[PDB]
């Protein structure tokens, strides 16, 4: 028997689905998502890291003039400064006083740290969805790990589980992401080869080990101070270091829908988005015939207490007369009320206790136990606590669900006015009919 | 659960208050004043003898 149901993509919240195969006793499966992972396919555009500026010992050409040469190094700059009169600890370096030039050159290289400290600029593509589901089957809860793509069926305990596709293609990751370590950021990083000084991407390489380096640091060489051999320059500070200080919050802290973000691989986990279709192939051996199953009669329901606490704050006691010893599935006939127990044991004439959770001030629901339905009703109180550390076990209330006492007041007032109108309408109709008749 | 009730200041007479907390069986507490003391703050003016 192939059973197809849809559950919310909320993780850590169990949902009950009723399996109804005609001729067989109803069965209830409890399914809970333990983990949902969206893993984007990534393509690396480039690596951003701190740059180092390399400045070879300056060449001082004494009693003559130096010349520049053009090199292909990533951000090479070279200039000749005339009129230099450098001194060393032991005195003047050059014999000539004015016929002396200094050849200063510099270039930018990726630092030695770029193999460890770097940020990777990735392009994100359609994610592969995966999920871990806990299913309570035949009284035994089995963990199923499968891809949420409507394919890649996984069979456990001779039952085939197909999960997905996801009802939503939403992902916390944009087309362009940057990964530093455990922190993933959504930013429109610049094109490769088009980085800007002082900003993220000022120095770029395709891979950490690549020798192909782009750099735009505005490395302008300046004239040395008199009497010295130092090589001054004006260069924008690494945009990587600036970025590290100005990163802001990562997606782990900013993502919508409570998504958890992790790296290695990049993952979005437990996003409360949309829902997940599930199809279960249940073997015939898993079903008990209606004639073989216990049958209940003379059922009645009472509710000693109810609080709409969102934590199974209601308890119902149901009296029954069982035809024989055995087990019965239990299912709520309304979304308004969620019952914690999926199955109970029934023995002769006795009573069963089940817990339930509802948002309703007045709990009006029907409970089906192995094909026999009993109507339950209760007045539910509000909780005293304002805040809890767990998601509601029940669904939303809606406008259609109002307390019985309030409903009575609404009908009394509505009927009161409606009756006055009906009377006034009748009076006018009678007068019009009489006025019409007379001529 | 905070329960607020009021009893007479009469001493030696037990009073019963019902603590009705929905979801739990009703609890009844019996309270009796054994002693009530009003101790005035005094400032000595003088001694007569
Ligand atoms: C199969 O397992 C599920 C889930 O239980 C979780 O996973 C297990 C492998 C263990 O690691 C558990 O520790 C873990 O919670 C069972 O459902 C859950 O069972 C636990 C108890 O094992 C319930 O928690 C208890 O709740 C009572 C309430 O009064 C507390 O007093 C206890 O201290 C404890 O917290 C938990 O509520 C329940 N889940 C739900 C939604 O009710 C499941 O019963 C089990 N099935 C079988 C056949 O083993």
XYZ file of C-alpha atoms and ligand atoms in Angstrom:
537
model
C 0.000 0.000 0.000
C 1.427 3.368 -1.096
C 0.563 6.150 1.328
C 1.200 9.742 0.335
C 1.125 12.573 2.843
C 2.565 16.035 3.320
C 4.139 17.323 6.504
C 5.383 20.827 7.425
C 9.110 21.388 7.090
C 9.370 22.353 10.744
C 12.122 20.323 12.386
C 11.670 18.714 15.799
C 7.885 18.599 15.557
C 6.160 15.193 15.110
C 3.167 14.869 12.801
C 0.617 12.081 12.602
C -0.666 10.635 9.359
C -3.531 8.178 9.205
C -3.075 5.199 6.924
C -6.480 4.006 5.813
C -6.478 0.807 3.791
C -10.079 -0.416 3.320
C -10.704 -3.812 4.872
C -7.871 -3.303 7.356
C -7.647 -1.640 10.747
C -6.509 2.022 10.502
C -2.854 2.627 11.284
C -1.176 5.804 12.484
C 2.382 6.744 11.645
C 4.225 9.391 13.608
C 6.833 11.241 11.609
C 9.330 13.787 12.880
C 12.020 15.595 10.957
C 15.285 15.435 12.863
C 17.374 17.312 10.339
C 16.865 19.058 7.016
C 19.891 20.098 4.978
C 20.168 22.251 1.872
C 23.588 21.883 0.291
C 24.274 24.343 -2.581
C 26.526 23.406 -5.447
C 29.462 25.769 -5.377
C 31.850 27.104 -7.973
C 34.925 28.989 -6.826
C 35.563 32.302 -8.544
C 38.553 33.405 -6.494
C 40.442 33.580 -3.216
C 40.866 36.816 -1.295
C 43.665 37.110 1.275
C 46.124 39.578 2.746
C 48.783 40.846 0.372
C 52.429 41.528 1.063
C 54.422 44.275 -0.593
C 57.820 43.184 -1.805
C 60.531 45.806 -1.958
C 63.970 44.617 -3.139
C 66.970 46.530 -1.881
C 66.945 49.884 -3.757
C 69.665 50.390 -6.304
C 71.735 53.489 -5.828
C 73.742 54.333 -8.900
C 76.609 56.549 -7.807
C 78.026 59.102 -10.231
C 75.447 58.191 -12.868
C 71.781 57.747 -13.782
C 69.699 54.597 -13.262
C 66.956 53.424 -15.621
C 63.577 51.743 -15.149
C 62.546 48.351 -16.486
C 59.012 47.053 -16.989
C 58.162 43.827 -15.186
C 54.996 41.730 -15.351
C 54.672 41.344 -11.593
C 51.103 41.765 -10.214
C 51.271 45.445 -9.265
C 54.773 46.430 -10.295
C 55.909 50.016 -9.903
C 59.331 51.514 -10.562
C 60.750 55.026 -10.366
C 64.143 56.737 -10.448
C 64.793 59.479 -7.924
C 67.512 61.975 -8.746
C 69.592 64.086 -6.376
C 69.871 61.416 -3.688
C 72.608 61.643 -1.070
C 72.209 58.511 1.109
C 74.268 57.875 4.221
C 75.247 54.667 5.941
C 76.346 54.301 9.533
C 79.954 54.823 8.460
C 79.319 57.851 6.242
C 78.153 58.731 2.738
C 77.481 55.851 0.365
C 78.170 57.743 -2.880
C 81.330 59.565 -3.942
C 79.451 62.154 -6.066
C 77.243 64.786 -4.451
C 74.581 65.399 -7.099
C 75.160 62.822 -9.819
C 73.365 60.112 -7.910
C 70.046 58.403 -8.545
C 68.011 55.796 -6.703
C 66.086 53.086 -8.497
C 63.096 52.092 -6.402
C 60.851 49.201 -7.322
C 58.075 47.241 -5.677
C 55.399 44.664 -6.407
C 52.502 42.964 -4.656
C 52.430 39.258 -3.848
C 49.980 37.056 -2.013
C 51.185 36.643 1.564
C 52.485 33.355 2.932
C 49.391 33.222 5.124
C 47.032 32.885 2.112
C 47.201 29.106 2.395
C 45.528 29.283 5.804
C 43.899 32.690 6.214
C 41.693 33.491 3.250
C 38.121 33.974 2.101
C 36.650 31.987 -0.766
C 34.321 33.664 -3.256
C 31.767 31.100 -4.445
C 28.852 31.024 -6.850
C 25.818 29.179 -5.505
C 23.644 26.925 -7.652
C 20.535 24.839 -7.022
C 20.932 23.044 -3.709
C 20.633 19.339 -3.075
C 18.093 18.767 -0.328
C 18.604 16.027 2.253
C 16.704 15.024 5.362
C 16.735 12.704 8.349
C 13.290 11.478 9.353
C 12.134 9.639 12.472
C 9.202 7.360 11.730
C 7.195 5.452 14.317
C 6.296 2.270 12.490
C 4.653 -0.784 14.036
C 5.474 0.595 17.489
C 9.174 0.959 16.615
C 10.681 4.317 15.612
C 13.263 3.958 12.824
C 15.558 6.666 11.469
C 15.540 7.257 7.715
C 18.284 9.184 5.931
C 17.387 10.160 2.372
C 17.624 12.867 -0.281
C 14.592 15.149 -0.422
C 14.271 15.124 -4.199
C 11.370 12.709 -4.702
C 13.893 10.017 -5.606
C 16.536 7.837 -3.987
C 14.048 5.762 -2.028
C 15.309 4.271 1.223
C 13.925 1.025 2.605
C 13.953 0.271 6.324
C 12.163 -2.583 8.080
C 10.777 -3.599 4.692
C 9.086 -0.238 4.149
C 10.084 2.114 1.350
C 10.371 5.815 2.127
C 10.465 8.534 -0.514
C 10.902 12.110 0.623
C 10.510 15.368 -1.284
C 10.699 17.269 -3.521
C 10.595 20.361 -1.332
C 7.569 22.624 -1.753
C 9.935 25.584 -1.669
C 13.144 26.278 -3.559
C 14.084 29.017 -1.127
C 17.655 29.102 0.137
C 19.388 31.540 2.543
C 22.318 31.646 0.140
C 22.421 34.205 -2.656
C 24.037 33.624 -6.031
C 27.270 35.042 -4.659
C 28.609 33.977 -1.280
C 31.865 34.429 0.601
C 33.224 31.866 3.029
C 35.941 32.740 5.532
C 35.775 29.844 7.975
C 32.551 28.786 9.657
C 31.028 32.086 8.559
C 29.194 32.419 5.252
C 28.301 35.869 3.926
C 25.956 37.045 1.171
C 27.825 39.747 -0.711
C 28.203 40.895 -4.286
C 31.952 40.392 -4.444
C 33.678 42.135 -7.400
C 34.547 40.403 -10.710
C 37.863 38.623 -10.921
C 40.551 40.978 -12.161
C 38.417 43.999 -11.294
C 39.068 44.396 -7.575
C 39.458 47.766 -5.851
C 42.091 49.043 -3.367
C 41.205 49.054 0.319
C 38.197 46.860 -0.414
C 37.498 43.153 -0.350
C 39.033 41.550 -3.423
C 41.902 44.030 -3.802
C 44.129 40.986 -4.241
C 42.769 37.912 -5.998
C 43.849 34.440 -7.100
C 41.856 31.539 -8.528
C 43.144 29.039 -5.973
C 45.212 29.378 -2.737
C 48.144 27.672 -4.470
C 47.817 29.533 -7.785
C 50.597 31.803 -9.013
C 48.137 33.869 -11.039
C 47.598 36.942 -8.898
C 45.648 40.122 -9.554
C 46.325 43.149 -7.411
C 45.129 46.738 -7.298
C 46.635 48.432 -4.274
C 47.590 51.853 -5.636
C 51.217 51.140 -4.829
C 52.729 54.540 -5.512
C 56.435 54.940 -4.818
C 57.527 58.111 -3.060
C 60.822 59.967 -2.881
C 63.111 58.831 0.005
C 63.902 61.295 2.757
C 67.233 63.039 2.474
C 70.244 61.100 3.691
C 68.421 57.773 3.792
C 68.105 54.647 1.665
C 64.588 53.660 2.702
C 61.846 53.158 0.116
C 58.599 54.987 1.043
C 55.284 54.324 -0.637
C 51.576 55.039 -0.464
C 49.506 51.881 -0.713
C 45.944 51.093 0.300
C 45.865 48.739 3.352
C 44.683 45.210 2.691
C 40.982 45.069 1.962
C 40.999 41.614 3.486
C 42.001 42.932 6.887
C 39.511 45.756 6.569
C 36.836 43.252 5.637
C 37.655 41.038 8.607
C 37.075 44.006 10.902
C 33.985 45.153 8.984
C 32.459 41.745 8.201
C 29.278 42.296 10.169
C 26.994 39.405 11.067
C 27.205 36.143 9.128
C 24.233 34.229 7.719
C 24.419 31.958 10.730
C 23.006 34.863 12.718
C 21.020 36.790 10.092
C 19.311 34.096 8.014
C 15.457 34.003 7.824
C 13.350 31.060 9.000
C 15.794 30.180 11.764
C 18.280 28.572 9.343
C 21.478 27.164 10.792
C 24.550 27.746 8.667
C 27.659 25.583 8.581
C 30.669 25.154 6.319
C 32.838 22.332 5.022
C 30.564 21.691 3.163
C 28.395 24.789 3.050
C 25.011 23.865 4.473
C 21.717 25.452 5.417
C 20.017 23.380 8.067
C 16.594 23.133 9.650
C 14.981 26.010 7.729
C 11.298 26.273 8.626
C 10.210 26.749 5.038
C 7.268 25.226 3.201
C 6.552 21.519 3.514
C 7.842 18.088 2.514
C 5.795 15.394 0.687
C 6.415 11.857 1.942
C 5.474 8.596 0.238
C 5.602 5.320 2.147
C 5.284 1.847 0.647
C 3.801 -0.266 3.420
C 3.914 -4.102 3.099
C 0.703 -6.105 3.461
C 2.155 -7.845 6.505
C 2.017 -4.533 8.357
C -1.777 -4.426 8.232
C -4.307 -6.218 10.422
C -7.727 -7.049 9.001
C -10.744 -5.319 10.520
C -12.157 -8.689 11.520
C -8.858 -9.680 13.133
C -8.429 -6.361 14.909
C -10.190 -5.504 18.200
C -13.412 -3.558 17.830
C -14.637 -1.050 20.381
C -18.193 -0.173 21.298
C -20.044 1.782 23.969
C -17.415 4.512 23.954
C -17.651 7.721 25.963
C -15.240 10.619 26.519
C -14.584 13.041 29.355
C -11.810 15.560 29.933
C -10.795 15.985 33.611
C -8.658 18.965 32.676
C -7.504 21.040 29.703
C -5.083 23.921 29.297
C -4.153 25.233 25.859
C -0.491 25.411 26.853
C 0.822 24.169 23.508
C 2.521 21.386 25.465
C -0.072 18.612 25.566
C -1.919 20.396 28.354
C -5.121 18.410 27.915
C -5.908 14.863 28.985
C -8.890 12.870 27.779
C -10.269 9.754 29.419
C -12.159 7.461 27.095
C -14.212 4.532 28.325
C -14.590 1.564 26.005
C -15.905 -1.963 25.681
C -13.432 -4.042 23.690
C -14.423 -7.186 21.834
C -10.997 -8.629 22.605
C -7.456 -7.882 23.750
C -5.239 -6.141 21.213
C -3.911 -2.809 19.986
C -5.798 0.105 18.391
C -4.585 3.130 16.467
C -5.689 6.520 17.790
C -6.275 9.523 15.541
C -7.798 12.986 15.869
C -10.478 13.850 13.330
C -9.689 17.548 13.538
C -6.511 19.508 12.937
C -7.496 21.644 15.899
C -6.521 18.898 18.328
C -3.295 16.896 18.290
C -3.097 13.612 20.198
C 0.295 12.476 21.475
C -0.395 8.740 21.512
C -0.443 6.976 18.146
C -1.565 3.618 19.502
C -3.017 2.120 22.656
C -3.604 -1.319 24.116
C -7.236 -2.249 24.742
C -8.387 -4.971 27.126
C -12.033 -5.870 27.696
C -14.094 -3.159 29.373
C -11.859 -0.377 30.647
C -10.675 3.164 30.026
C -7.794 4.692 28.098
C -5.876 7.885 28.785
C -4.533 10.123 26.037
C -2.897 13.533 26.044
C -3.651 16.267 23.553
C -2.680 19.777 22.525
C -5.000 22.447 21.175
C -5.218 26.196 20.617
C -8.961 26.144 21.180
C -10.699 27.691 24.164
C -13.387 25.070 23.670
C -12.040 21.721 22.612
C -14.535 20.063 20.312
C -13.064 17.026 18.630
C -13.638 13.437 17.628
C -11.255 10.617 18.425
C -11.069 7.518 16.279
C -9.855 4.367 17.987
C -9.516 1.329 15.655
C -12.436 2.592 13.519
C -14.766 3.632 16.344
C -15.299 7.362 16.829
C -16.123 9.103 20.100
C -16.979 12.774 20.540
C -14.983 14.699 23.176
C -15.686 18.166 24.539
C -13.955 20.369 27.097
C -13.483 23.885 28.406
C -9.775 24.684 28.070
C -7.998 27.257 30.200
C -5.104 29.566 29.247
C -1.568 28.919 30.584
C 0.024 31.187 33.167
C 3.416 31.149 31.479
C 3.867 33.684 28.696
C 6.954 32.218 27.037
C 8.253 28.712 26.329
C 11.470 27.278 24.914
C 9.727 24.999 22.431
C 7.493 25.340 19.325
C 3.781 24.675 19.636
C 2.804 21.030 19.306
C -0.515 22.073 17.758
C -1.641 24.042 14.704
C -3.122 27.533 14.444
C -6.552 28.491 15.774
C -8.272 30.299 12.914
C -11.291 32.612 12.996
C -13.794 29.775 12.743
C -12.870 28.423 16.165
C -14.572 30.330 18.963
C -15.569 29.229 22.460
C -19.000 27.709 22.964
C -19.997 30.296 25.538
C -18.935 33.079 23.201
C -20.730 31.388 20.312
C -23.899 31.262 22.368
C -23.651 34.974 23.104
C -23.092 35.720 19.427
C -26.151 33.732 18.405
C -28.269 35.306 21.139
C -27.364 38.829 20.072
C -27.482 38.081 16.364
C -30.812 36.323 16.800
C -32.107 39.174 18.942
C -31.457 41.748 16.236
C -32.378 39.395 13.410
C -35.705 38.718 15.103
C -36.455 42.416 15.474
C -35.702 42.877 11.792
C -37.821 39.863 10.870
C -40.723 41.315 12.828
C -40.328 44.767 11.338
C -40.031 43.186 7.903
C -43.245 41.257 8.429
C -45.088 44.381 9.507
C -43.968 46.242 6.407
C -44.873 43.309 4.174
C -48.350 43.094 5.676
C -48.913 46.818 5.253
C -47.652 46.724 1.678
C -49.867 43.751 0.867
C -52.890 45.506 2.348
C -51.955 48.757 0.645
C -51.510 46.871 -2.609
C -54.841 45.082 -2.254
C -56.755 48.301 -1.650
C -57.293 50.611 -4.645
C 1.474 29.276 41.778
C 0.719 32.479 43.709
C -2.481 32.416 45.737
C -3.761 35.555 47.412
C -6.351 35.437 50.166
C -7.497 37.591 53.053
C -8.327 36.492 56.568
C -9.675 38.326 59.649
C -7.078 39.341 62.211
C -8.914 37.333 64.854
C -6.444 35.054 66.620
C -7.107 31.385 67.366
C -9.705 31.001 64.629
C -8.720 28.821 61.624
C -9.738 29.875 58.124
C -9.797 27.774 54.991
C -8.833 29.006 51.560
C -9.321 27.058 48.358
C -6.441 27.014 45.923
C -7.936 26.267 42.540
C -5.233 25.767 39.936
C -6.653 24.456 36.624
C -5.087 21.163 35.609
C -4.531 20.194 39.237
C -6.760 18.773 41.950
C -8.102 21.558 44.242
C -6.011 22.198 47.342
C -7.312 23.481 50.662
C -5.075 25.287 53.108
C -6.040 25.839 56.712
C -4.542 28.957 58.229
C -4.719 30.059 61.842
C -3.170 33.067 63.497
C -1.381 32.007 66.651
C -0.096 35.435 67.549
C -0.258 38.967 66.207
C 2.080 41.570 67.657
C 2.072 45.316 67.131
C 5.336 46.671 68.472
C 5.444 50.498 68.657
C 8.658 52.299 67.925
C 9.529 54.237 71.050
C 11.658 57.247 71.853
C 12.436 57.872 75.512
C 11.629 61.359 76.722
C 12.406 61.129 80.429
C 12.499 59.085 83.619
C 10.247 59.789 86.587
C 11.132 58.432 90.037
C 11.546 6.333 20.088
O 12.222 7.574 20.346
C 11.331 8.728 20.427
C 12.161 9.985 20.537
O 12.964 9.994 21.705
C 14.261 10.661 21.433
O 15.137 9.753 20.748
C 15.454 8.558 21.525
C 16.339 7.670 20.675
C 16.144 8.945 22.850
O 17.390 9.589 22.608
C 15.218 9.899 23.627
O 15.869 10.320 24.831
C 14.897 11.134 22.768
O 13.986 11.978 23.461
C 10.392 8.523 21.629
O 9.550 9.655 21.852
C 10.034 10.480 23.006
O 10.416 9.657 24.123
C 11.002 10.413 25.223
C 11.408 9.428 26.300
O 12.242 8.405 25.775
C 9.998 11.452 25.761
O 10.655 12.294 26.717
C 10.198 12.044 28.114
O 8.976 12.757 28.377
C 8.466 12.587 29.736
C 7.170 13.362 29.850
O 6.592 13.214 31.141
C 9.511 13.090 30.752
O 9.054 12.868 32.079
C 10.825 12.319 30.537
O 11.820 12.802 31.443
C 11.316 12.509 29.093
O 11.631 13.874 28.853
C 9.527 12.332 24.587
O 8.542 13.259 25.049
C 8.925 11.471 23.461
N 8.545 12.319 22.335
C 7.317 12.814 22.276
C 6.902 13.680 21.129
O 6.508 12.564 23.178
C 9.537 7.290 21.298
O 8.583 7.066 22.340
C 10.463 6.076 21.175
N 9.659 4.923 20.774
C 10.081 3.714 21.085
C 9.292 2.510 20.683
O 11.138 3.581 21.711
